[PDB]
Amino acid sequence: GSHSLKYFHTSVSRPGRGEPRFISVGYVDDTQFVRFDNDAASPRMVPRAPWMEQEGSEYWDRETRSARDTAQIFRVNLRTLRGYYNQSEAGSHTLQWMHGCELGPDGRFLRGYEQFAYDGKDYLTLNEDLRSWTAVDTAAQISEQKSNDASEAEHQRAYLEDTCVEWLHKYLEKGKETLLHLEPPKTHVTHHPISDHEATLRCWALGFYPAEITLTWELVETRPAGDGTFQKWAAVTCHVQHEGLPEPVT
Amino acid sequence: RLPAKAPLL
Amino acid sequence: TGVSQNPRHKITKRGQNVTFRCDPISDHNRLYWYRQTLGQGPEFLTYFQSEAQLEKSRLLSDRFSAERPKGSFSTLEIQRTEQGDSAMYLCASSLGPNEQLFGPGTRLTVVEDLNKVFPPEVAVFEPSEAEISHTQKATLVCLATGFYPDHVELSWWVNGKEVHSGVCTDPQPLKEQPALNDSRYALSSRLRVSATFWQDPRNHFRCQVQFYGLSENDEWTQDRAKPVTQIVSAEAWGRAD
Amino acid sequence: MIQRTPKIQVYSRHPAENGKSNFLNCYVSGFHPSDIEVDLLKNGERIEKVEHSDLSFSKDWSFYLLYYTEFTPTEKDEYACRVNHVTLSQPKIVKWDRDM
Amino acid sequence: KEVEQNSGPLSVPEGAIASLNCTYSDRRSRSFFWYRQYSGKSPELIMSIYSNGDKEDGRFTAQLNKASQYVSLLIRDSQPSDSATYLCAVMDREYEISFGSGTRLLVRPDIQNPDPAVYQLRDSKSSDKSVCLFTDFDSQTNVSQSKDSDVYITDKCVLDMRSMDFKSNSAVAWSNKSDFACANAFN
């Protein structure tokens, strides 16, 4: 896999209880590095990785501004999308927005993407050309037209191709000690007897970064340790693939 | 870094 | 919802304070304050992201200040007002870094003394007989004289309704004495109709001049009537045959 | 309107050794909408000082949080994760199995 | 200046295409705006362009060239109603807007049948006061302030009698001395 800079934006309308909830989280690869929560008193972008704690106020001012602007545009979008679907004011609804750029082995732009989802279901998607949008619904068609007429894609393309890449480079550098350092799984198998008749084998992987991994031989979803690393196991030899070890350990 | 201008739906 | 700003015109005595208000478009989180003088573009003063004042001009005077307490309406206050403060104070809102849409502005004139402020005298002049026979067309002229300051809005009214067609108001007023810096202003306007229309004596022609003067909160210590904001009409009826 | 039920995983950062400090992790995932309540339990008792990751989501738009607390496990003490979501009619409880 | 515009008056005959042109410093500027501002009024947003090429709205065309760092406004079939200051506004890579000083457009009105004439009018209320009206001249005529001080003379002005598709230029003069001859006043 390739280096990336992604953000995951969530807006939730709160009928009766005032302005919608809004949260943005920034990830380089599988490391989270920033957060904005609008439920704070004076809501600001904050660092959420030790290598971001040395950034000046110029940076946090700007990201705080972007996030606040986003939160306000998302508030309007929720109200607008309500009208499109002829839903009442009484019910809570969700707008989500993921966007990210990826580098190739050459450290150049490789691909960008953006997607909006309304109440868990895809709504509007940026196309690979980074020049046009694709609706799913009829509702999303008014959005496509509106976005198209607005040249919304011109803005997102410059972000994805130039900004998102220039800043991904700055983040990989500021936190090289942690982001470029690989950590392969520590593997072992454990014996769990169900009776004298049947037994259960469990292939463990622990303390690995990044979270991409395959356990081959009941497959449990990859999960975080809370120290930056990840954990996984499979159950019924066991083959373990991860970009941190030269060949699959069996 | 965030994009300034979240798209308008 | 557009952008509201009050007052539209404001006369203040040099050395006094003034405070303008702006109400932005509901869903707009950004509010911008700009100043504009003759034949220049808007100059940045300050802007607010909701309640947060994020920037101010490096050159902004200590006398200039703005607030947006509830993150809604914004006020701009000028203290110890000077002649040079005379300008157009524009407010603009935007939804994030989208388009900036402007309010109708607050035009501030800062005058030496409020006794210099007079309202307009207005006369309508009837069409020349010569013009009617030559052209089968009749040009009413309206004249507004002895007003200060320059704030005026002239309109033509025919049979109770305001007319735009055949109307033409001077671009800008002219000084009754180019010599004096505190000179009073005159402004002319033309309404042209068909000779037959001017000759129907059932037709009523009114030149209305809206003057922006003192507010009810301005103190007036003089014999002549308080030169408040007010309308001054003059009229004419059609002459038959 | 899409609703998905949390997948819960109760587990520890490091392998469990009695007497020595660790972290207890509850990983709720695959849920929608975002409103969820998550307590960690020490023998059915609500643990007070509990922290949680910032709300994020996966490619299917489903939400995921980590609730975690610093704990010293013992051979006697039982631990669990209590999770309420609009989708459940009653709180789901998952007990910590140090072999899982 | 981050944003450049010829401030000088741009004179154009009614029906010509007006070409308003604006140049910006930051090669990564994000959005580009044309405001119309009539005398004594606030700027009105008329065109918004972001992408290389042309946007069309009525008799208006916005042209954006990110390579030459030019942004232009075209006014088809230019009418005197378009006489106004046109303000160029550009948001830089950071989305911080700058307004150029603006370009004053003056659309000279189409006068088909000049009939240069001066007349004299009397006040509806008082026989005693008069004004002189120079009317019907063509859009190249130059009106001049007199050297009597007590003689006031206005700048020209085009009315448009919509119903009869007729247009006329007009200028006024008056005094309070009453030696005042109408036939001379205009030179």
XYZ file of N, CA, C and O in Angstrom, chain A residues 3 9 16-17 32 65 69 76 82 95 109 115 121 130 174 189 207 209:
72
model
N 1.318 5.775 0.689
C 1.105 6.858 1.683
C -0.139 7.659 1.298
O -0.434 7.749 0.104
N -15.222 13.528 8.038
C -16.108 14.592 8.567
C -17.490 13.997 8.858
O -18.045 13.375 7.937
N -34.497 20.392 17.920
C -34.796 21.001 19.232
C -33.544 21.484 19.952
O -33.580 22.595 20.489
N -32.475 20.682 19.971
C -31.267 20.895 20.819
C -30.205 21.728 20.076
O -29.021 21.520 20.365
N -3.901 8.623 13.266
C -4.678 9.878 13.461
C -3.730 10.954 14.008
O -2.901 10.607 14.862
N -10.252 27.665 11.346
C -11.070 28.412 10.354
C -11.678 27.450 9.328
O -12.900 27.501 9.129
N -15.792 26.869 9.040
C -16.399 27.017 7.682
C -17.071 25.697 7.267
O -18.264 25.725 6.911
N -25.882 23.849 6.658
C -26.741 24.290 5.524
C -27.077 23.062 4.672
O -28.251 22.891 4.315
N -32.606 18.000 3.613
C -33.924 17.764 4.256
C -35.009 18.101 3.226
O -35.884 17.249 3.001
N -24.842 13.776 7.787
C -23.984 14.019 6.604
C -22.556 13.618 6.961
O -22.041 14.140 7.960
N 1.828 12.732 -6.751
C 0.367 12.477 -6.691
C 0.111 11.155 -7.431
O 0.736 10.948 -8.482
N -16.222 11.690 -1.289
C -17.560 11.058 -1.258
C -18.372 11.720 -0.150
O -17.812 11.906 0.951
N -25.848 6.072 3.565
C -25.913 5.663 2.132
C -25.161 6.689 1.277
O -25.368 7.888 1.506
N -11.538 14.006 -11.551
C -11.485 15.093 -10.527
C -12.111 16.374 -11.107
O -11.678 17.488 -10.713
N 7.645 15.475 9.520
C 7.547 15.950 10.928
C 7.502 14.747 11.873
O 8.018 14.878 12.997
N 0.606 -19.138 18.281
C -0.687 -19.885 18.282
C -0.924 -20.408 19.701
O 0.065 -20.733 20.392
N 0.729 -6.023 17.902
C 1.736 -4.945 17.949
C 2.249 -4.552 16.570
O 3.397 -4.059 16.501
N 2.068 -2.348 12.873
C 1.683 -1.133 12.107
C 2.339 -1.181 10.729
O 3.533 -1.466 10.627
